[PDB]
Design an enzyme around this catalytic site. Structure first.
Site, PDB file in Angstrom:
ATOM      1  N   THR A 139      -1.717   1.458   3.476  1.00  0.00           N
ATOM      2  CA  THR A 139      -1.665   2.209   4.729  1.00  0.00           C
ATOM      3  C   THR A 139      -1.545   1.254   5.902  1.00  0.00           C
ATOM      4  OG1 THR A 139      -4.088   2.400   4.746  1.00  0.00           O
ATOM      5  CG2 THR A 139      -2.844   4.310   3.967  1.00  0.00           C
TER       6      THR A 139
ATOM      7  N   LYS B  64      -5.963  -7.302   5.059  1.00  0.00           N
ATOM      8  CA  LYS B  64      -6.308  -6.340   4.011  1.00  0.00           C
ATOM      9  C   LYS B  64      -7.388  -7.008   3.164  1.00  0.00           C
ATOM     10  CE  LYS B  64      -1.982  -6.518   2.885  1.00  0.00           C
ATOM     11  NZ  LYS B  64      -1.521  -5.116   2.660  1.00  0.00           N
ATOM     12  N   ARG B  65      -8.084  -6.232   2.340  1.00  0.00           N
ATOM     13  CA  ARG B  65      -9.106  -6.801   1.466  1.00  0.00           C
ATOM     14  C   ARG B  65      -8.510  -7.886   0.561  1.00  0.00           C
ATOM     15  NH1 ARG B  65     -14.307  -4.150   1.187  1.00  0.00           N
ATOM     16  NH2 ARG B  65     -14.655  -5.632  -0.526  1.00  0.00           N
TER      17      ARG B  65
ATOM     18  N   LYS C 270       0.719   1.206   9.605  1.00  0.00           N
ATOM     19  CA  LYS C 270       0.181   0.824  10.922  1.00  0.00           C
ATOM     20  C   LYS C 270       1.064  -0.210  11.643  1.00  0.00           C
ATOM     21  CE  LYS C 270      -4.416   1.366   8.842  1.00  0.00           C
ATOM     22  NZ  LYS C 270      -5.682   0.647   8.497  1.00  0.00           N
TER      23      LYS C 270
ATOM     24  N   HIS D 222      -6.328   6.754  -6.628  1.00  0.00           N
ATOM     25  CA  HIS D 222      -6.003   5.672  -5.688  1.00  0.00           C
ATOM     26  C   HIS D 222      -5.653   4.314  -6.323  1.00  0.00           C
ATOM     27  CE1 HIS D 222      -7.205   7.968  -2.049  1.00  0.00           C
ATOM     28  NE2 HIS D 222      -8.099   8.510  -2.857  1.00  0.00           N
TER      29      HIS D 222
ATOM     30  N   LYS E 134      -2.964  -8.215  -4.343  1.00  0.00           N
ATOM     31  CA  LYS E 134      -2.373  -8.192  -3.000  1.00  0.00           C
ATOM     32  C   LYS E 134      -1.681  -9.522  -2.660  1.00  0.00           C
ATOM     33  CE  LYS E 134      -5.741  -4.818  -1.198  1.00  0.00           C
ATOM     34  NZ  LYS E 134      -4.838  -3.759  -0.640  1.00  0.00           N
TER      35      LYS E 134
HETATM   36  O1  LIG Z   1      -9.352   1.316  -0.922  1.00  0.00           O
HETATM   37  C1  LIG Z   1      -9.234   1.629  -2.112  1.00  0.00           C
HETATM   38  N1  LIG Z   1     -10.266   1.623  -2.969  1.00  0.00           N
HETATM   39  C2  LIG Z   1     -11.528   1.285  -2.653  1.00  0.00           C
HETATM   40  O2  LIG Z   1     -11.915   0.930  -1.537  1.00  0.00           O
HETATM   41  C3  LIG Z   1     -12.521   1.393  -3.819  1.00  0.00           C
HETATM   42  C4  LIG Z   1     -13.890   1.500  -3.557  1.00  0.00           C
HETATM   43  C5  LIG Z   1     -14.783   1.603  -4.621  1.00  0.00           C
HETATM   44  C6  LIG Z   1     -14.276   1.599  -5.922  1.00  0.00           C
HETATM   45  C7  LIG Z   1     -12.898   1.493  -6.126  1.00  0.00           C
HETATM   46  N2  LIG Z   1     -12.070   1.391  -5.089  1.00  0.00           N
HETATM   47  N3  LIG Z   1      -8.054   1.978  -2.630  1.00  0.00           N
HETATM   48  C8  LIG Z   1      -6.851   2.033  -1.772  1.00  0.00           C
HETATM   49  O3  LIG Z   1      -6.690   3.410  -1.322  1.00  0.00           O
HETATM   50  C9  LIG Z   1      -5.663   3.528  -0.315  1.00  0.00           C
HETATM   51  C10 LIG Z   1      -5.680   4.994   0.156  1.00  0.00           C
HETATM   52  O4  LIG Z   1      -5.017   5.835  -0.799  1.00  0.00           O
HETATM   53  C11 LIG Z   1      -4.288   3.054  -0.855  1.00  0.00           C
HETATM   54  O5  LIG Z   1      -3.348   2.984   0.215  1.00  0.00           O
HETATM   55  C12 LIG Z   1      -4.380   1.670  -1.528  1.00  0.00           C
HETATM   56  O6  LIG Z   1      -3.144   1.382  -2.190  1.00  0.00           O
HETATM   57  C13 LIG Z   1      -5.570   1.622  -2.512  1.00  0.00           C
HETATM   58  O7  LIG Z   1      -5.734   0.325  -3.104  1.00  0.00           O
HETATM   59  C1  LIG Z   2      -5.692   0.268   7.214  1.00  0.00           C
HETATM   60  C2  LIG Z   2      -6.883  -0.601   6.862  1.00  0.00           C
HETATM   61  C3  LIG Z   2      -7.024  -1.087   5.552  1.00  0.00           C
HETATM   62  C4  LIG Z   2      -6.000  -0.807   4.490  1.00  0.00           C
HETATM   63  O1  LIG Z   2      -4.985  -1.832   4.410  1.00  0.00           O
HETATM   64  P1  LIG Z   2      -4.006  -2.060   3.153  1.00  0.00           P
HETATM   65  O2  LIG Z   2      -3.165  -3.163   3.666  1.00  0.00           O
HETATM   66  O3  LIG Z   2      -3.272  -0.787   2.967  1.00  0.00           O
HETATM   67  O4  LIG Z   2      -4.892  -2.435   2.043  1.00  0.00           O
HETATM   68  C5  LIG Z   2      -8.096  -1.902   5.210  1.00  0.00           C
HETATM   69  N1  LIG Z   2      -9.053  -2.211   6.150  1.00  0.00           N
HETATM   70  C6  LIG Z   2      -8.943  -1.732   7.442  1.00  0.00           C
HETATM   71  C7  LIG Z   2     -10.002  -2.088   8.442  1.00  0.00           C
HETATM   72  C8  LIG Z   2      -7.865  -0.924   7.813  1.00  0.00           C
HETATM   73  O5  LIG Z   2      -7.794  -0.506   8.982  1.00  0.00           O
END
Ligand SMILES: O=C(NC(=O)c1ccccn1)N[C@@H]1O[C@H](CO)[C@@H](O)[C@H](O)[C@H]1O
Ligand SMILES: *Cc1c(COP(=O)(O)O)cnc(C)c1O
Ligand SMILES: O=C(NC(=O)c1ccccn1)N[C@@H]1O[C@H](CO)[C@@H](O)[C@H](O)[C@H]1O
Ligand SMILES: *Cc1c(COP(=O)(O)O)cnc(C)c1O
Lengths: 808, 808
Positions: A647, A539-540, A651, A348, A545
């Site tokens: 992702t 997003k986080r 959405k 990931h 980002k």
């Molecule tokens: O969200 C994460 N990791 C974490 O939350 C995480 C948690 C603990 C340690 C490392 N990491 N990874 C996300 O995974 C998504 C699904 O494939 C991708 O769309 C994103 O590009 C990717 O950043």
């Molecule tokens: C979809 C979703 C994410 C992932 O968002 P990215 O923009 O792909 O990092 C994170 N948090 C929540 C609550 C989501 O629904």
């Protein structure tokens, strides 16, 4: 009320009302005189849950009779959100329940707001697991999600003086009506101890025992009567001065206490390692038990697939070896063959600081037998490398599972590749980057292992549930079949010049924006102009980002307005939200900056309602379901090569927002599906980033040559956005000028120019909406049904089915 | 099957069967193919629970409309045992449920054995609270039991190598179907902090907050449709590096983690003090809230009675003052008047080491405002003493709530007397001893405060439930009314010469003994002769209860047999059971001695089946319900003046055992009711103990003059009962010879002689049984219905009622 929410038949409504009243009386022990809205929520939740039970029992019975290959999805995170509405949608009960509750004098939407999010994940990885469970059930796969029942999920975020404060997420306080405790299936998990070698193999002795108690949650498929299981493990002490011994049971039970919220930086904490082994050891025992309850492990890979969601459950590989070799007494080579054919690994991220590298000394103490097995795996693997690339000594050290240095570490990603028959990235560009850069050596040895599986989202939660207005206008034209076959959305292209449809699309968006604008006032006391462009980045909070790049654009618009106050500009509401990992100082500074910009911009009388900057507090799944349908512009602006997929981007595309973004992760495939003319693409590509890295990135160059950028940095440095603390943002300026890994300045000019083009199109509502239709119509590829079908056929070796099981 | 278990009507049986199947399906999520006996238990428990709900809601509604004076019974202990059968009995559902389960192919008795004891008490004090709740519901009083929901109750006792081992009592593991969590009524409790004095009174600030979450359990009256509430508080942390902060929530929640098992010796542990304040602060807020939901606290004592079960909730007195003075702003004297008229105190022992004397420094840190209030109470109280007894300076120091010394302590008993309108002992002799000795000064000041309320037991649990065979033969002759009017048992005296009844009484006893003899083999693999006299001493292990005296008799019988092997002796099975407090070394040594005697006696071929010594493992309420109906002889042999009442004694009397006992506690009143000719009374009276204390007790005198006693001590010392560890019992011999507070040797001769008279009567079955009938027939006084009616009329100022509420 609306077609896609199902029938509200006379008998169903009457039956739901009486079962509601029964639960209120017998289950909650209340009557209508004392009952609070929370009581009404629970009565409804129990009523809906009853409808799952029959289907749940017969689905599991069906799997027992038919004995299909079972899919085990192992994840440390399942970001489920709320369950009530999703269950109603998948069972076709939404209109019936809406009617039943209306007749009892209750608003169902108000009751839905009472449910706590199951926030057992950080973001994308955790939410992917949740979407995947939904799709696996919808596609009729014999699938089980396995994880940890954290009593505290992702923290609730409070903003205090512009700063993030973390609050414990006590999500189980009022009880969870969806789970069923299964204390009868409790299993032991072992820790510490030591290894003894007898004449008949190795033995792991003198261990500490922690019990793993399962809790099962139903996962309903979309209108197919399939109900799969998500099993989450809870830690329990075994039953065997006196007072302190009882109180010390907490130490064992701390394993399942709290989700690690650090999604940016690997820490190497013992408790996290314990969590990872705990889920793995309990799950594998359960799998083997179920496999035996069908002696010969040759057929094990024919009946079991284990999917590893990142390296977090990577200990599954040496644990399976341990069980097969030490307990089942299989020889090494046969056990290894079975393990490889059973396991598959999903990566990931490519960011090195996120990769799990466990110190050897930690594994030595906690899992001494597993370390011995890892060393043996490594030796045999390197023997293969040496035979394939003779004399290539540097390749040997690069590919080793054991990393040398001050502290020796195990590279869990290398372990996963060695022990899996399939390794996949989560978007085409990401999977290519894996093969070209970080796993290049492994690709050269075993090219057949490496695959792509582009991510997706479930259109049940992410269209039908959260945007019923849009789902309905679509269904009016093309019927309902698209909900479980999202490719059918392409049929909407023949409506791009349809004046009625254009009007309906824009109306649904306007309604969503008014709805969200009122939500903001009622729950957060903030005023916004619903006619403005809703510019959203949720997003986080991470440096990669590039929320900071968004911040620079915001300040640019503010400075341009202050320079030419009486010039027309397209009004914007800029919304940014997301949580920062508690230890991530820079991410916490970024949140402070956003709120600080808002404080200046939102109170400038010259600006008026032409520009608003709002920080969206406590971003989570339930908030995403509200804000995404309301958005006009989706910000997907990570430095090219850093966001594995994304992702959230998908959405927004599904819900009628246009995208401004870099050619990163899944953005590339999104633009490809919709056409580049229908996307706002800007900035460096991966190749451009590489070229700049060879040169050496010098931020000063941009500062010197872009006067508008210089002004912003001068404002940040001088204390324009923090009058009382002039040097508050010195860390941010310093990073941007001297230590910016993510090249914020390098994309600034093209970003601002591209944003001007967005504003230009928004001035023409008809052409904006037509481009929106072109996006929605080509979003079909990004259904997790497509993603899961690809996993099933190309990795797990099972065929999906849309055929329904008989209804009870 | 039997009359007293109610009707098994066609409609009720059919309805119970279908509700059973519904719960199995919807509640447990199982079907008949996978269901275990535990699943069947829960399905039945949920089915029975449903029948309580309607009655529970309308009882509480009735109290709201009628607004009677409410009774609040505050206890740190509620020793409830199992709930399923008791609920069936009180609702008249036992036969119907037995029939329903039989038709489903299940044995209800087998399912009953699956239920965990609610072991939230140590022994007599905790069990008294449980019997009291049952009687208050049966007598139609608006009564609430308030305590702590310990997640671990009294430890499970394992015997390993003859030694007691303690095991955590994880009673909530599989869930508790009887409780209803009420998270909506959660209340804050404050700790630590400091006191500030403003112009407008004192203020308690900078406190730590722990949340108190209530769990409600229904308490059904006997066939009157009354269902009262037992509310137990659970500790919760408030929601406001990061990982550790979350993990540290355990520290707050430890308050409700575990029951203190030390019933012999006061320890002064901070956690125990926290428990005591926690229950008090949460309860009083709840009381005041309910009182307001009916401004003027003059009527407070007219609407509220608070009963303090020993000094454990004594902080209620200064807490009520705190709330009335600091929060409600009442003047001191009026608040004091209200407090005194509201509170009443029950004492349960005269042994000084058991009395609560909290170090001042502990109260100073934990409850600074309460200490200030206690000092003020003390000053005003001593001013009254000084005015009543001028110049009596020693009386002043004796009566002070503050004890002087190395560490200053607060005497909680003195606080309770000062702040209560009524103080009672628990048997006539005990209440007299309070007035003559330990509380003499207080009696002289306020004679009107001092009362007696002789203890009782509920004949529902302690006859109908545990001995249905005896309940039935009684009902055949005198009808069913005695169950809620136990005085009617006197009617049985006219059957003392009835040959049919004599035969039936002896038959029921024989059946009970065979039943228990088979239980011993099936669950513990031990063989006993069911024709032998069942000689039983079951109660907590304490020096004062003189299990050691019983041990000496056992060894005497063994030595007499070995001396004259071919002489006839009445065969005996001597059974001793009970738990020792984990810190009580001597009590643990006593258990070891018992098992050690058994090891010698039970394997001597010359003895055969003429004598058996068994230690009854894990004595608890569910075990009491089995062994008591099986007993022939009840051992109640505490040193005169030490057992405040006893309640086990009453259980045996009701169930057809004869009593060998000292004139101590309630034994005195039992002998008085039955006639001394029908009791085996021996040993020193209180006066004789006093005379011996004046002289000085010299154990050597008895050793020198009783050759049979000398032989036993020589055997103990030489290692006769511990060949491998010759000096194992040196502590016991030393205590007996030099430091025996309880004068074991002084009662030895009369005890042995009296035991010979027991054996003589047992040789004549007809005359044994006739004496038994005389005991059962006069046991009516010892119903807790009588006890509770006396509390109601003489302390609480409320009238009991046998009138039923309308059935739903
Ligand atoms: O969200 C994460 N990791 C974490 O939350 C995480 C948690 C603990 C340690 C490392 N990491 N990874 C996300 O995974 C998504 C699904 O494939 C991708 O769309 C994103 O590009 C990717 O950043
Ligand atoms: C979809 C979703 C994410 C992932 O968002 P990215 O923009 O792909 O990092 C994170 N948090 C929540 C609550 C989501 O629904
Ligand atoms: O059981 C106890 N105390 C305890 O359990 C105890 C617990 C903690 C501290 C002190 N103590 N007390 C018992 O109370 C019974 C009911 O009145 C009487 O019949 C008994 O005579 C009395 O000993
Ligand atoms: C009745 C009872 C007691 C009290 O017995 P005493 O002989 O009065 O001390 C203790 N434990 C249990 C389980 C009881 O039922």
């Amino acid at each position: 009320q609306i077609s896609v929410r199902g029938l509200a038949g006379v008998e169903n409504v009457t039956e739901l009302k009486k079962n509601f009243n029964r639960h209120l009386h017998f289950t909650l022990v209340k009557d209508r005189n004392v009952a609070t809205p929370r009581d009404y929520y629970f009565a409804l939740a129990h009523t809906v849950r009853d409808h799952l039970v029959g289907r749940w029992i017969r689905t599991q019975q069906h799997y027992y009779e038919k004995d299909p290959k079972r899919i085990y999805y192992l994840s440390l995170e399942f970001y489920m959100g709320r369950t009530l509405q999703n269950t109603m949608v998948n069972l076709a009960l939404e209109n019936a329940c809406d009617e039943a509750t209306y007749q009892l004098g209750l608003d169902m939407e108000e009751l839905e707001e009472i449910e706590e999010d199951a926030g057992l994940g950080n973001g994308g990885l955790g939410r992917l697991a949740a979407c995947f469970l939904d799709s696996m059930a919808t596609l009729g796969l014999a699938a089980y999600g396995y994880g940890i029942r954290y009593e505290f999920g992702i923290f609730n975020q409070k903003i205090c003086g512009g700063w993030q404060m973390e609050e414990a997420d006590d999500w189980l306080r009022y009880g969870n009506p969806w789970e069923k405790a299964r204390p009868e299936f409790t299993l032991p998990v072992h820790f510490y101890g030591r290894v003894e070698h007898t004449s008949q193999g190795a033995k792991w002795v003198d261990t500490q025992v922690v019990l793993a108690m399962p809790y099962d949650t139903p996962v309903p498929g979309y209108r197919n009567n399939v109900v799969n299981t998500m099993r989450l493990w809870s830690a329990k002490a075994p039953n065997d001065g006196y007072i302190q011994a009882v109180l010390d049971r907490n130490l064992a039970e701390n394993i399942s206490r709290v989700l690690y919220p650090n999604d940016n930086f690997f820490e190497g904490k013992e408790l996290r390692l314990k969590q990872e082994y705990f889920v793995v050891a309990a799950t594998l025992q359960d799998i083997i038990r179920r496999f035996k309850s069908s002696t010969n492990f040759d057929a094990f890979p024919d009946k079991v697939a284990i999917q590893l969601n990142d390296t977090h459950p990577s200990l599954a590989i040496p644990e399976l070896m341990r069980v097969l070799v030490d307990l089942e007494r299989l020889d090494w080579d046969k056990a290894w063959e079975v393990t490889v054919k059973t396991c598959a690994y999903t990566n990931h991220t490519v960011l090195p600081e996120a990769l799990e590298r466990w110190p050897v000394h930690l594994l030595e103490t906690l899992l001494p037998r597993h370390l011995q097995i890892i060393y043996e795996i490594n030796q045999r693997f390197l023997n293969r490398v040496a035979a394939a690339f003779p004399g290539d000594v540097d390749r040997l050290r690069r590919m080793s599972l054991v990393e040398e240095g001050a502290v020796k570490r195990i590279n869990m990603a290398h372990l996963c590749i060695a022990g899996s028959h399939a390794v996949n990235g989560v978007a085409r560009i990401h999977s290519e980057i894996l093969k070209k850069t970080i796993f290049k050596d492994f690709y050269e040895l075993e090219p057949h292992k490496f695959q792509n599986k582009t991510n997706g989202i479930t259109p049940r939660r992410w269209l039908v549930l959260c945007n019923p207005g849009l789902a309905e206008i679509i269904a009016e034209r093309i019927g309902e079949e698209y909900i479980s076959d999202l490719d059918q959305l392409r049929k909407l292209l023949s409506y791009v010049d349809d004046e009625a449809f254009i009007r309906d699309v824009a109306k649904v968006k306007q309604e969503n924006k008014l709805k969200f604008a009122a939500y903001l006032e009622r729950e957060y006391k903030v005023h916004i102009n619903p006619n403005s462009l809703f510019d959203v980045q949720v997003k986080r909070i991470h440096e990669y980002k590039r929320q900071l790049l968004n911040c620079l654009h915001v300040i640019t618009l503010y400075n341009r307005i202050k320079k030419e106050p009486n010039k027309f500009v397209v009004p914007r509401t800029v919304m940014i939200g997301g949580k920062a990992a508690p230890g991530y100082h820079m991410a916490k500074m970024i949140i402070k900056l956003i709120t600080a910009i808002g404080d200046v911009v939102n109170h400038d009388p010259v600006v008026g309602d032409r520009l608003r900057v709002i920080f969206l507090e406590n971003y989570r799944v339930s908030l995403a379901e509200k804000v995404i349908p309301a958005a006009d512009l989706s910000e997907q602006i990570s430095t090219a090569g850093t966001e594995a997929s994304g992702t959230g981007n998908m959405k927004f595309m599904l819900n009628g927002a246009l995208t401004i973004g870099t050619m990163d992760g899944a953005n590339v495939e999104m633009a490809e599906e919709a056409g580049e003319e229908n996307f706002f693409i800007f900035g460096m590509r991966v190749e451009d980033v590489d070229r700049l890295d060879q040169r050496g990135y010098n931020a000063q160059e941009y500062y010197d040559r872009i006067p508008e950028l210089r002004q912003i940095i001068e404002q940040l440095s001088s204390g324009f956005f923090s009058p009382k603390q002039p040097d508050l943002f010195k860390d941010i300026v310093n990073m941007l000028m001297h230590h910016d890994r993510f090249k914020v300045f390098a994309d600034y000019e093209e970003y601002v120019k591209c944003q001007e083009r967005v504003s230009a199109l928004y001035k023409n509502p008809r052409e904006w909406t037509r481009m929106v239709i072109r996006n929605i119509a080509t979003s079909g590829k990004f259904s997790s049904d497509r993603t899961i079908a690809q996993y099933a056929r190309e990795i797990w070796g099972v065929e999906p089915s849309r055929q329904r099981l008989p209804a009870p």
